Coordinates of C-alpha atoms and ligand atoms in Angstrom, one line a residue:
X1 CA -36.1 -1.1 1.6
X2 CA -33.8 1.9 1.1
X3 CA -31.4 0.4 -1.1
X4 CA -33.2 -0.6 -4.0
X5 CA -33.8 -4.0 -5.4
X6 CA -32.3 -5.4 -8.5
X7 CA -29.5 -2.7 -9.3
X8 CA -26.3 -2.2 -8.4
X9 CA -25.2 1.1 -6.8
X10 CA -21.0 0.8 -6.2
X11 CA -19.0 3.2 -4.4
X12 CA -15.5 3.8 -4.9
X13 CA -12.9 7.1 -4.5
X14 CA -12.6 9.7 -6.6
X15 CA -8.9 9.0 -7.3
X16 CA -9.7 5.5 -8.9
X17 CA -10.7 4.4 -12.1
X18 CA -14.5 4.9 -11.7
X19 CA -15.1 5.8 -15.3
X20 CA -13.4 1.9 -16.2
X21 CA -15.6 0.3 -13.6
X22 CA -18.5 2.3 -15.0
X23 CA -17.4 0.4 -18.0
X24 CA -17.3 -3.2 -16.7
X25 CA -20.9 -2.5 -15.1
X26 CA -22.6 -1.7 -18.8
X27 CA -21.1 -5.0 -20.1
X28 CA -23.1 -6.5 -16.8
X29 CA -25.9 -4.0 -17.8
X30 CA -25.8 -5.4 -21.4
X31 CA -25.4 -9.7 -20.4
X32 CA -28.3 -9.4 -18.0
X33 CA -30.4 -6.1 -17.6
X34 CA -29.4 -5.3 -14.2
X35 CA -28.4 -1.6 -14.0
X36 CA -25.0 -0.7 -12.3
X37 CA -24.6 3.0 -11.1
X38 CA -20.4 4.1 -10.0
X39 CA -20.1 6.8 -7.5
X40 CA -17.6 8.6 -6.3
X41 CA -18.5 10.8 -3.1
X42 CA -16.2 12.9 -1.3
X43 CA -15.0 11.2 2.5
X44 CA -15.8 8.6 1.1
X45 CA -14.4 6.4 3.9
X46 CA -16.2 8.0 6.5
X47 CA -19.7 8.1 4.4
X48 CA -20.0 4.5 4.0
X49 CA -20.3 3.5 7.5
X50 CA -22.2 6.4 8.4
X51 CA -24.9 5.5 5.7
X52 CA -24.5 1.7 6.1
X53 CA -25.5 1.9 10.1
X54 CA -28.7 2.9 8.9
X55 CA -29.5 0.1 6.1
X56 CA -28.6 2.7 3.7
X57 CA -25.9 3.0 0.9
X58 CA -23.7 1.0 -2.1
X59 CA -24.3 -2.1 -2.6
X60 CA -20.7 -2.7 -3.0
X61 CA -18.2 -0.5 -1.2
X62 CA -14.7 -0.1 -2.3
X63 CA -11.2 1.0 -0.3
X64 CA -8.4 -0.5 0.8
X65 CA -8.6 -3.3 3.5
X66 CA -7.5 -1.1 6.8
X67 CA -11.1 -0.1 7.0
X68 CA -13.0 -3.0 6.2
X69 CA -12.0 -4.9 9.9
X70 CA -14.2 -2.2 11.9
X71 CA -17.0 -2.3 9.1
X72 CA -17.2 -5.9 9.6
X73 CA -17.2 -5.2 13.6
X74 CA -20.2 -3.2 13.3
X75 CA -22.0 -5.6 11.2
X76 CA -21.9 -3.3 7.8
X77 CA -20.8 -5.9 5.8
X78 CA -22.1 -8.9 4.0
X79 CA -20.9 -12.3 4.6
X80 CA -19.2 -13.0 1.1
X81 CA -18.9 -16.6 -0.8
X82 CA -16.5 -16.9 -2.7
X83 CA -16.1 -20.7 -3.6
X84 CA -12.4 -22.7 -3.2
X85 CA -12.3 -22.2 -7.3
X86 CA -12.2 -18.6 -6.7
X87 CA -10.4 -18.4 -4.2
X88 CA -7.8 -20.0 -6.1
X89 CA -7.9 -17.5 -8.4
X90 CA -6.7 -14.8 -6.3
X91 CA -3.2 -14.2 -4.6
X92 CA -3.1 -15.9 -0.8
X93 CA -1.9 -12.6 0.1
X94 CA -4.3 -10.5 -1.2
X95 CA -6.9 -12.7 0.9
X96 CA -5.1 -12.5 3.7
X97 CA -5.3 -8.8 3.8
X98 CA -9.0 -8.8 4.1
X99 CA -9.5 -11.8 6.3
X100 CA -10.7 -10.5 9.7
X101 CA -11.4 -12.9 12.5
X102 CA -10.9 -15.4 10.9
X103 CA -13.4 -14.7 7.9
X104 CA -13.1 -13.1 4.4
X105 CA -15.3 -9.8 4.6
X106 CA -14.4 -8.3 1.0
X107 CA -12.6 -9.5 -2.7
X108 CA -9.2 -7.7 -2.7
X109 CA -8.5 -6.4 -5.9
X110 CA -4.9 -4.9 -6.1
X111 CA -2.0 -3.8 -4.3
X112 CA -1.0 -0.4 -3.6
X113 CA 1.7 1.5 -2.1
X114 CA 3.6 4.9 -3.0
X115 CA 6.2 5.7 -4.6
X116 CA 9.0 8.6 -5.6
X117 CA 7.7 9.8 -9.2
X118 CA 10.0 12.7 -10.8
X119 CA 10.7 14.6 -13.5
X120 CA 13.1 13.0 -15.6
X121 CA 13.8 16.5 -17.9
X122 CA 14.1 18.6 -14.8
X123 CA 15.8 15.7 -12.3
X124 CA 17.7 13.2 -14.3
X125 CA 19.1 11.7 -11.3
X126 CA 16.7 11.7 -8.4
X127 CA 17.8 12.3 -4.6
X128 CA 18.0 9.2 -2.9
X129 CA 17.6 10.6 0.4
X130 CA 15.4 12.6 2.1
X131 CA 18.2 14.5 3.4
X132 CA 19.7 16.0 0.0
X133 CA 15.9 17.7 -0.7
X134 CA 16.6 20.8 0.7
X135 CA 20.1 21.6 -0.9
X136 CA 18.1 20.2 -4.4
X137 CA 15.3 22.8 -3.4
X138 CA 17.6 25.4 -3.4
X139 CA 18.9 25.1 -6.8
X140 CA 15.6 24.4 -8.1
X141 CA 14.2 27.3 -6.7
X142 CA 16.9 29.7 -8.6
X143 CA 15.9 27.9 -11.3
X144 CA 12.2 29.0 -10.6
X145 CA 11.1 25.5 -9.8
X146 CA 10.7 23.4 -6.8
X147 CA 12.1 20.0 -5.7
X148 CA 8.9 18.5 -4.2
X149 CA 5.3 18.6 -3.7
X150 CA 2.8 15.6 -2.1
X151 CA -0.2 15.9 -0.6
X152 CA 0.2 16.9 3.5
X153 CA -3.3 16.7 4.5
X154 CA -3.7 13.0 4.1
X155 CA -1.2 11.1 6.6
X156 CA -0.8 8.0 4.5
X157 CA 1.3 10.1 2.3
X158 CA 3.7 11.3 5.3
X159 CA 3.9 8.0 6.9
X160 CA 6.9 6.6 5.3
X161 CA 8.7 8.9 6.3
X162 CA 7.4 8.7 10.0
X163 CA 8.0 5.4 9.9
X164 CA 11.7 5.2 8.4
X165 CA 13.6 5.8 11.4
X166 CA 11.2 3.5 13.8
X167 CA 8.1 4.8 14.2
X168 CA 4.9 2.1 14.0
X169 CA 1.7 1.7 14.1
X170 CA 0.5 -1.0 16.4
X171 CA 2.9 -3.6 17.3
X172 CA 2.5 -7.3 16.0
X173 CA 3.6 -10.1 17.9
X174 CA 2.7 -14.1 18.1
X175 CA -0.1 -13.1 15.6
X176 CA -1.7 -10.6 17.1
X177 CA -2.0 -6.7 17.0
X178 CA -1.5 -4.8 20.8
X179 CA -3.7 -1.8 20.2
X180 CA -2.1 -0.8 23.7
X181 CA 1.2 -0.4 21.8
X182 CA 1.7 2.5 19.5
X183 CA 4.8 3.7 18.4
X184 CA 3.4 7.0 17.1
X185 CA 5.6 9.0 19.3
X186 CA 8.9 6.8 19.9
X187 CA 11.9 8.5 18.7
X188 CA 12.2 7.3 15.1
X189 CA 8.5 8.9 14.6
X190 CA 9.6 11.8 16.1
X191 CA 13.1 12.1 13.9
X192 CA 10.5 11.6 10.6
X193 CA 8.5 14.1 11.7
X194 CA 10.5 16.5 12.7
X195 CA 12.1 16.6 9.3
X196 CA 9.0 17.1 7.7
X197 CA 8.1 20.3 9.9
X198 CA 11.8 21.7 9.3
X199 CA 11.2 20.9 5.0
X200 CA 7.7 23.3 5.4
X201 CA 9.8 25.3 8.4
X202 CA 12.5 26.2 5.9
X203 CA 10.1 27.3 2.7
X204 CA 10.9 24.4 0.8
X205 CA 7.1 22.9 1.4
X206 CA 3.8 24.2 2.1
X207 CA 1.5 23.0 4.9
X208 CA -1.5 23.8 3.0
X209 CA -0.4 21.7 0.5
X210 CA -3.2 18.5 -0.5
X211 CA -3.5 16.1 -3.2
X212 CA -4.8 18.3 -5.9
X213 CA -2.5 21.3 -5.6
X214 CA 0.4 18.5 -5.4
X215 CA -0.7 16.8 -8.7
X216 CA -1.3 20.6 -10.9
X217 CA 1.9 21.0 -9.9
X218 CA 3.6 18.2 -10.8
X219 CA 1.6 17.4 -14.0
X220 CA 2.4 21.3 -15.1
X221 CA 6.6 21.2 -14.3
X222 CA 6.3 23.4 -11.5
X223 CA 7.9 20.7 -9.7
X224 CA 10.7 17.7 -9.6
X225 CA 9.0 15.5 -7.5
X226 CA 5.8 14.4 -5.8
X227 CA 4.9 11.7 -4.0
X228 CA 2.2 9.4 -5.6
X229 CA 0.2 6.0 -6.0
X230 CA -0.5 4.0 -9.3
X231 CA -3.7 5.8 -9.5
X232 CA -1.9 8.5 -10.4
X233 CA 0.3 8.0 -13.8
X234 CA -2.8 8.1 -15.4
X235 CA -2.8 12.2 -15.6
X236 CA 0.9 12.2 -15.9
X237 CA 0.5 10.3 -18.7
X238 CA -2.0 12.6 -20.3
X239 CA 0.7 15.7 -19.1
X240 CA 3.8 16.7 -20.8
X241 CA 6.4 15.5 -18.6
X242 CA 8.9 12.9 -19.0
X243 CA 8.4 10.9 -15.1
X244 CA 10.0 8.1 -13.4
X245 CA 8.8 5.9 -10.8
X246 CA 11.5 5.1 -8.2
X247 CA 12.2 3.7 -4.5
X248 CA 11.2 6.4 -2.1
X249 CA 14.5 8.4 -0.5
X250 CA 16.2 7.1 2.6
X251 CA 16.0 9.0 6.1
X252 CA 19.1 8.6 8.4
X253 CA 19.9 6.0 5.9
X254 CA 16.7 3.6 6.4
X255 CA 14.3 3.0 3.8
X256 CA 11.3 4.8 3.8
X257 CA 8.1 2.4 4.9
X258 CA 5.2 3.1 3.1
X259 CA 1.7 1.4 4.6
X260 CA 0.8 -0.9 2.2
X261 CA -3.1 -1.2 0.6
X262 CA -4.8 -4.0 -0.8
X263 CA -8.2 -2.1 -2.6
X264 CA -11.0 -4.5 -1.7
X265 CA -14.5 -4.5 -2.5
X266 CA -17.4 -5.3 0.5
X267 CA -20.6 -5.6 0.3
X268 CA -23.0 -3.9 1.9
X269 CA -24.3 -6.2 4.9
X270 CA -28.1 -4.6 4.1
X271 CA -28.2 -4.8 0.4
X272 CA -31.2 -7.1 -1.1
X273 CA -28.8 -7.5 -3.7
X274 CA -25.8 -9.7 -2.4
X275 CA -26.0 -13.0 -5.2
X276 CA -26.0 -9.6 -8.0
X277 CA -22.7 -8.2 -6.4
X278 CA -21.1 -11.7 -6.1
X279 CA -21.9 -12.2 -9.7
X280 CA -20.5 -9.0 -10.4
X281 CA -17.8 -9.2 -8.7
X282 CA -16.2 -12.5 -9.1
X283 CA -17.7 -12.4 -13.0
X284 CA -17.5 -9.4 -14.0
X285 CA -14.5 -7.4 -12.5
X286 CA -12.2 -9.8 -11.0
X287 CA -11.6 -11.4 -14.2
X288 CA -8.6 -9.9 -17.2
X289 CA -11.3 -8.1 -19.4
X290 CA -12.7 -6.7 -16.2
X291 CA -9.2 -5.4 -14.5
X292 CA -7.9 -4.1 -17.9
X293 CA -10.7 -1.7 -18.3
X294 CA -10.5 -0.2 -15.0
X295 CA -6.3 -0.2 -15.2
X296 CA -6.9 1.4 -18.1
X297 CA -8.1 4.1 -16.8
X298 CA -6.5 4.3 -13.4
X299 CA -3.7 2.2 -12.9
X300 CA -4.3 -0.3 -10.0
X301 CA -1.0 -1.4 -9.0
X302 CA -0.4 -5.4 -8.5
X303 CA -3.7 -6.9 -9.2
X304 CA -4.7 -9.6 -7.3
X305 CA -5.9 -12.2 -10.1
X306 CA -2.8 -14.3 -11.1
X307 CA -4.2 -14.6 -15.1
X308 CA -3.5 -11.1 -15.1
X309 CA -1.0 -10.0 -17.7
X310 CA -2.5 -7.8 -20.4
X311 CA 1.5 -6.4 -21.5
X312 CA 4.5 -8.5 -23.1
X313 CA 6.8 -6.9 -20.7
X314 CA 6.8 -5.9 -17.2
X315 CA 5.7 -2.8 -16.1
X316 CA 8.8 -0.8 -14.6
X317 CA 6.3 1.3 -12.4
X318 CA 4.8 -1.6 -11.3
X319 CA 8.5 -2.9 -10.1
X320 CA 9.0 0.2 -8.8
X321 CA 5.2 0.0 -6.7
X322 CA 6.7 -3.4 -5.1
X323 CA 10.0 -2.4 -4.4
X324 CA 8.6 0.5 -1.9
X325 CA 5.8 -2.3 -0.4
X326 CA 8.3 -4.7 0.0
X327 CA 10.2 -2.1 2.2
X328 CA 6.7 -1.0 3.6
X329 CA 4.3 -3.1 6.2
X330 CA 1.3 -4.2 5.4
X331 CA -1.7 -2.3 7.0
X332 CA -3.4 -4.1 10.3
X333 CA -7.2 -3.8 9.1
X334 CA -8.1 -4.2 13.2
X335 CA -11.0 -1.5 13.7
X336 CA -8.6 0.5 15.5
X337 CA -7.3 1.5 12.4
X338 CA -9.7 4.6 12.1
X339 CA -8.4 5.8 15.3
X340 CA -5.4 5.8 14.5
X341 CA -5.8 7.6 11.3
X342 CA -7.5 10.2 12.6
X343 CA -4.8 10.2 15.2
X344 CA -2.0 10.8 12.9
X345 CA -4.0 13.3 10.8
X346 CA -4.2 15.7 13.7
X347 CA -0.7 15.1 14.3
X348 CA 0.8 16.1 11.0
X349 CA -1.7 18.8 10.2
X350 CA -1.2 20.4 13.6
X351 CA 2.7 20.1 13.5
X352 CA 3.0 21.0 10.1
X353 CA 1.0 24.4 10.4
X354 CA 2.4 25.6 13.7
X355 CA -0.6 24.7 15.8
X356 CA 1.4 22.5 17.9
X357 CA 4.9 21.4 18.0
X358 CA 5.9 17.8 17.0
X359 CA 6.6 16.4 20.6
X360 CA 3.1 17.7 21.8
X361 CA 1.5 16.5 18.3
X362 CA 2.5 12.9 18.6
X363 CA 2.4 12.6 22.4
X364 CA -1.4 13.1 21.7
X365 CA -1.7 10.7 18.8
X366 CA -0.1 8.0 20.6
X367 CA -3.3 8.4 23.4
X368 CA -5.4 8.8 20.6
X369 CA -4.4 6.2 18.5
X370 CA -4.4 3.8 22.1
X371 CA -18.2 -0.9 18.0
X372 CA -17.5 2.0 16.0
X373 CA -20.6 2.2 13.8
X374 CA -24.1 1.8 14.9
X375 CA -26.8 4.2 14.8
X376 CA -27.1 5.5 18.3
X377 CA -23.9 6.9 17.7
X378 CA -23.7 7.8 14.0
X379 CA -27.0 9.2 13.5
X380 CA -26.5 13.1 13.3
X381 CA -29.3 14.3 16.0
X382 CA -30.3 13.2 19.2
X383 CA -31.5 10.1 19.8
X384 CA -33.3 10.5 23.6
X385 CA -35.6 13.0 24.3
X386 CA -35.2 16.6 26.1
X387 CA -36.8 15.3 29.1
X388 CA -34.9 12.6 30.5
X389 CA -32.7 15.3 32.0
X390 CA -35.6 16.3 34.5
Ligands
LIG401 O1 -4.4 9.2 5.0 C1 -5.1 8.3 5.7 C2 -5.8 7.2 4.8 O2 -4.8 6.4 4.2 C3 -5.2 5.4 3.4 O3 -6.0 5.9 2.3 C4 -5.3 6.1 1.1 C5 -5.8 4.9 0.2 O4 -5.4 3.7 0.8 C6 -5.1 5.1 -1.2 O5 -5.7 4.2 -2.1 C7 -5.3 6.5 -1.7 O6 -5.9 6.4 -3.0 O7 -6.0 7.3 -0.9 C8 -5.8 7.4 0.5 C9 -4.8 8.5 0.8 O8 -5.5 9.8 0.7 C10 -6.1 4.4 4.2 O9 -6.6 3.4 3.3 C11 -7.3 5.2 4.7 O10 -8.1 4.4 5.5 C12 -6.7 6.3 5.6 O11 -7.8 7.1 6.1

């Protein structure tokens, strides 16, 4: 077979704690000789399927649950176990989020969404709208600084503010997701987005600005503000600066609506080792010695095992993590959800650089965003020969 028998090979991004998990696979190492090898590949989301239509890949695959409906669609994905005891031990939401017609398809692990984090020595009191950021930009800049920087090449980080004022996804009614209705260019969409092409417009962002630029910045005190998930504090932890975690700023007075992630872990529908990553999984990780080593590294956010509770007192971040998903919606994880990702990408990136304006931007992501894997259509050649043309 091309995955090899009796390991485990887990994928998960580069952002996460991988270093924890690497952790929490040599105590599975040590208890019963089966080697565990974490990897972290770049596109990662888009890698998986592509190697999985083949037979290839991880064993176990992790990322949040949006993706995981259109791997289970085109069959990449194991059937997973997990007995009512188990079950049990996990939040009903957190299984909800990866329950996909009608079946679980991965173990969710934690609860994500972003927040405002901020320079407390530089910004005791933090803007609470979006609106005040250039005036604060202004005064920052005299003072050789800047008010923000977040990462503008991944559109889950621009989304709240797209959605504030009304924009949407697809729309959910009686239980069901219309993938006919997108509300990617409706007029609060276009009032988020806007704003954001006016912020780089005006000097007080940079289009090419992405995740790693956004995060030397902040983590040096080149910057007041960036726009971040749990993963994150890690670094700013290891930094010099002084940071709060805080409810995103308001736009036109509406919350902003940030697209919430459960981080859920599938496995791969052609491993020959699916009772390995069950054991793993459900004994290994999911479990308060497991979850503390990887939080430890990279913060997680809300876990989804209810033992959880390694501190004597909450954690304000974390407070701060659920105030922002309460105001947020929870990702569909319907396999149109790649399409519409890729959607919005093209949107922002184009409007933000110039390339288009924002009405033309978003009138195509709404087409756009209104099975995906097998391998006659992800394999990277041709798959019929030169002469069926004659
Ligand atoms: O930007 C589109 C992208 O958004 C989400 O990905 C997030 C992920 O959920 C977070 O955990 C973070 O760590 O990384 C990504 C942002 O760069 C969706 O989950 C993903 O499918 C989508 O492509």
């Amino acid at each position: 077979m091309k995955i090899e028998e009796g390991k485990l090979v887990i994928w998960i991004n580069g952002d996460k704690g991988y270093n924890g998990l690497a952790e929490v696979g040599k105590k599975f190492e040590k208890d019963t000789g089966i080697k565990v090898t974490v990897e972290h590949p770049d596109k990662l989301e888009e890698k998986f399927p592509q190697v999985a239509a083949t037979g290839d890949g991880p064993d176990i695959i992790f990322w949040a649950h949006d993706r995981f409906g259109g791997y289970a669609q085109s069959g990449l994905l194991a059937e997973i176990t997990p007995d009512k005891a188990f079950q049990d031990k996990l939040y009903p939401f957190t299984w909800d989020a990866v329950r996909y017609n009608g079946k679980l398809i991965a173990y969710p692990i934690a609860v994500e969404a972003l927040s405002l984090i901020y320079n407390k020595d530089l910004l005791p009191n933090p803007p609470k709208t979006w609106e005040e950021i250039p005036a604060l930009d202004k005064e920052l800049k005299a003072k050789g600084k800047s008010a923000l920087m977040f990462n503008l090449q991944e559109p889950y980080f621009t989304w709240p503010l797209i959605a504030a004022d009304g924009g949407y996804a697809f729309k959910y009614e009686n239980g069901k997701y219309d993938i006919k209705d997108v509300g990617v260019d409706n007029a609060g969409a276009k009032a988020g987005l806007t704003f954001l092409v006016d912020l780089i417009k005006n000097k007080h962002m940079n289009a090419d600005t992405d995740y790693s630029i956004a995060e030397a910045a902040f983590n040096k005190g080149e910057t007041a503000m960036t726009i971040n998930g749990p993963w994150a504090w890690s670094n700013i932890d290891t930094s010099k600066v002084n940071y709060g975690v805080t409810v995103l700023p308001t736009f036109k007075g509406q919350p902003s609506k940030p697209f919430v992630g459960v981080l859920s872990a599938g496995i791969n529908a052609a491993s020959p080792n699916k009772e390995l990553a069950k054991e793993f999984l459900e004994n290994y990780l999911l479990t308060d010695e497991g979850l503390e080593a990887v939080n430890k590294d990279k913060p997680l956010g809300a876990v989804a095992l209810k033992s959880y509770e390694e501190e004597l007192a909450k954690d304000p971040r974390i407070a701060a993590t659920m105030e922002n998903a309460q105001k947020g919606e929870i990702m569909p994880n319907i396999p149109q959800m790649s399409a519409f990702w890729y959607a919005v990408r093209t949107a922002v990136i184009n409007a933000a650089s110039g390339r288009q304006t924002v009405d033309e931007a978003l009138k195509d992501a709404q087409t756009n965003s209104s099975v995906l894997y097998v391998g006659s259509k992800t394999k990277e050649g041709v798959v019929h020969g030169v002469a069926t043309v004659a």
